[PDB]
Design a protein around this nucleic acid. Sequence first.
DNA 1: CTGGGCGGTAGAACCATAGTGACCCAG
DNA 2: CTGGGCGGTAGAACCATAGTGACCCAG
Lengths: 314, 308, 311, 315
Amino acid sequence: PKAKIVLVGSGMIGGVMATLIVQKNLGDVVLFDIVKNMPHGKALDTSHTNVMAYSNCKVSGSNTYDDLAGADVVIVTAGFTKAPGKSDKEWNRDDLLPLNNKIMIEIGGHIKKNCPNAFIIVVTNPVDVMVQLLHQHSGVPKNKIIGLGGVLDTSRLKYYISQKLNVCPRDVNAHIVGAHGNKMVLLKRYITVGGIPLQEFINNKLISDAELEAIFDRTVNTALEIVNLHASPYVAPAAAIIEMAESYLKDLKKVLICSTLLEGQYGHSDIFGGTPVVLGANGVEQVIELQLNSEEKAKFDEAIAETKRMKALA
Amino acid sequence: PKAKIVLVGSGMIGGVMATLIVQKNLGDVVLFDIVKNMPHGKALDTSHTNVMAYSNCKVSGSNTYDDLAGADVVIVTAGFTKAEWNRDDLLPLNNKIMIEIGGHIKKNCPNAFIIVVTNPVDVMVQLLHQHSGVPKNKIIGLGGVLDTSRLKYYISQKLNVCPRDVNAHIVGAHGNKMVLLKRYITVGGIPLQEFINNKLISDAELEAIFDRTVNTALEIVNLHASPYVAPAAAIIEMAESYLKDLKKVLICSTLLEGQYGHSDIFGGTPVVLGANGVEQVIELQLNSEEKAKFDEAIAETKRMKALA
Amino acid sequence: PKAKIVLVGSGMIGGVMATLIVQKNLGDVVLFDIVKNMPHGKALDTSHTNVMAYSNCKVSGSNTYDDLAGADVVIVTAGFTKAPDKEWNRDDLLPLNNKIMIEIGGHIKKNCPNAFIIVVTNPVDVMVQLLHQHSGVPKNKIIGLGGVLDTSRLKYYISQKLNVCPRDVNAHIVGAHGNKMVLLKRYITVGGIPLQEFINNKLISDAELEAIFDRTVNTALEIVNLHASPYVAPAAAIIEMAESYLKDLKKVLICSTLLEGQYGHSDIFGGTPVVLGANGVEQVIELQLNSEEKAKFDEAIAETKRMKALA
Amino acid sequence: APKAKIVLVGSGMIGGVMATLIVQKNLGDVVLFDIVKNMPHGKALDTSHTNVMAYSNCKVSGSNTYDDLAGADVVIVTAGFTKAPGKSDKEWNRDDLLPLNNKIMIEIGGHIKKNCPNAFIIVVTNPVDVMVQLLHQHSGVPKNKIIGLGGVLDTSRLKYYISQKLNVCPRDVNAHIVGAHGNKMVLLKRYITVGGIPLQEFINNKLISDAELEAIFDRTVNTALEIVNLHASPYVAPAAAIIEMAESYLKDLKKVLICSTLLEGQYGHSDIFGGTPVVLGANGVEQVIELQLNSEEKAKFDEAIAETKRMKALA
DNA sequence: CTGGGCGGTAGAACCATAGTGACCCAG
DNA sequence: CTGGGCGGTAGAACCATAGTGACCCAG
């Protein structure tokens, strides 16, 4: 039988996922949310695209975690992101930690009940924290659960570099590890263009250290830059998630940077962090540890510590 | 060079248009709107997806109609939609928007293929035809590709068959007075009647499906959503049959020049879309009752047109 | 894991099937043939395209039916087609290909009795049934290549006369693959509209259509005479059937299938629209033919029976 | 019109798979050309039917006249002699093909100058680094509009074998092979990457050894011969790689691809073609990327160019 | 006028979109 | 029983494919 993909959280990212799943004919889809009616309106609208996509994927809405039964893949986008109400007086980012943890407790008990064999991809912020919470509460194997990070962060670094150098955006390859968010580690040494080290282009003066540094800042701050323009980053995220999902379902064994459990790589254990892994039929088939230098380790360490500062507060 | 596609209106539907055009690598995309900054924001979000999709489309934002310069396709979703009061009251206002767009199309891309979406589409498209001055095989409205996609989908579900394998025609006007042609429905090329006679589906089941298709927009709004995914996709099907010269047969709103007995009005019929825009207008051989429904659809477009 | 697809026979049809399978990321592919080494060479050349296609399918060559182990789909193109010369009797190949089906079905029992089987070896409507008998698979799991291929020509020709998308023309040809095919002039449509309307509008004449039908019946023969032999369209038609099964698309497709009373016939295979999805043949759709068209159908079936008697 | 019109000059096995892929991918109208009578018409007629399966709308035509180059957007040249033409040709070696295939290129290039001076041309006829320059010389087209097939094909064998060893996606291996297509290709150990990471990190991790890499390198060099030794013939991958190049052009993808291109100073060489990564978009070769080779790598490039030169002198 | 207590994957209304700011009272 | 002319994007025939080897005299 066809893959069943559950979307836990039917907000904007969730809507773009549904769309791309039906474009790619990837599986049946359930748009789940606690908010009533709304996932149904989106599922119906999106289901008609089967005709235009020449696909055959059921799309439905849901308001019950019972719909997790038989799920092949679960994608968690739902969670608090801002002050929940007008009443929440002087609240900050950290305040959201106990609330999302409560959501992950609930979702994980239902995974454990309804789809202990699903492959799980967590997006809810801060993802490196949230993914570990959901791994702990679901009981799923460490290679069947991952967090969204590097694909997205890097797709913006690839893209900004590709514009300066006038090549296919995907012919830029870059790594960004450790954590998603402000403390992300941008690995200047591990950038390439058509498989050629970025440094050769800096030597030909096709791009300079300072323009690269400025691209490094714009990458770290992309989500802010977009919100400042009166929009919201949701298309990019959705597509990077679907890339990861697709690599699992179709067993492409792509090298993709995800948040994953470190069992001693980079000198860290029992914490999840961003690192390229190989994604196939078996989940995370390979965790690849980049042979960082000392100043690269130092940055990696500060991203891990920050993951740890927030985990403790959940 | 690569095709330039300009989205005139960057609300949700426009957002799904960019997205799809970058997945099929179909053209550079400009997201235009009068709302300051937001199109820049969405353009910037969408553009990153070149990477996941292996594409190489430039995706821009814009607040000037100057960026119509060199457009090969323009897609027009902008316009007043919300407020009892009378929906007819929006007609002169959206007429004023068509004027504006039209004269800018006159200046910057008189050779563009134009697709109109703004409701009521059959009126909006003619008004923009008229102010843009473009030739008549180069402008169309969205109508039946979207409408027939529900009908197609709903039937395929009852019959357990690939959605796309159901073909069905909906003519006349987009909206309330749309004409659902039961005699023109087929499943794998086979008339539906054969499946009714086999009792794989009943006449009253089909009737329920018909009412469901006419009220789909309303249903979705009732559900606390609003249709934009399917409309986007159906429009990108149109723009892609044109850009790739596929000559697909697609129902759309086009100028009637005597067909169905009507003139000087736009209305939903099958056409063939390809590199030359509207390449043929297929006029279905309607019996007398189907023709009474067509006529009511047209008279409704006319009645709205007179108020524009 | 990914779908395993065994191609039993690695002539040129086999080759195009492995390419498209890799282009569509459909499944690992095994090219089997009785001829030594040749399938390993083709496997090797095909496996490279994974890189250009962004796919990840294994392509292996084999000379052993043991490689049928774990197959999800099996496509049988192997068999004698050529004379031992000049004027001779093509019926002579019937018994010989019968032995081959016997042998394949022997190993299909052993190795992959749950596989979906697609048979191509001509005359297909006889060979498919022969393989159904010697393999023992459910009748919803074994179909022959027929109408997807034949109609694709019909649809293609009409599309060129009318200047629309090839795919926007639909038509049915049923009964048998080959010279007795029944071309149903009443079931052709163009973007969902009866052909008759375009006929009434003088955009294609009745005579033009008849000449198009003659050409659809004689397409193989026209290709051979231009010194080619048709294998691209066949491969792609088989890949359409395959895909609909593997991706559970539920496409309506004309295939050689087991008849249980439809068109008045039983215990024979013949061409008819089916629905293909993850359960195999999911519906056998019986066209509501008038007795003139039905008479054509019995002609096609009679021929199939006659050839079946000689195998 | 656009559609693109793509003319396959040579309707043999590679031309056959190319036409098919062009239809699968809706890339444009296809003319299968060849001097052999009728066969291109038959092949083009079999291939035309697949438009229905593919949901495409490409014309597929046969032709026996160079007149059908009129209005081509892309020309792909696979025609040429690859073996001793006849039983009567005794004691032929590879060099003897050079004058024959040169005559072919004079004939093709004359017709391009006449009917499609603005086409983009991809040459595949072996030895390809000599043949592309001969067609450049005899056609008169700009140097950014003519390339030969080399590195995309060779690199796909090395990306492949590595990926099998490391159990990753074949295309998440990137590698560079330069200089020339054939025996003297230069395999750059230093440039290999697996999902963006130097192959040296996996070697350090003992996931692949230096000796296994070397043996993979030998296989890459001899793949054509290893296929033919198994009673088959490499035509699928070649046709795939060619379509990859063509596509990057017809869609202005600006992919970095290794092609045989005109060297003007890069690697210390001029007035010769050789394999190097290039950028291919709407304007043809939009950039020629010179890899920053070290002196032993460059001595290798120098043996590749030398060989190309030796054969060029013989055409 | 505050201060805090709900209750919240918030809450209005702006108005060619959607991020910003979005409660309620007792006392 | 060799030799070499002509003509060749070669040429037979082996056959469950296709690469290998594939002409034809005049002396």
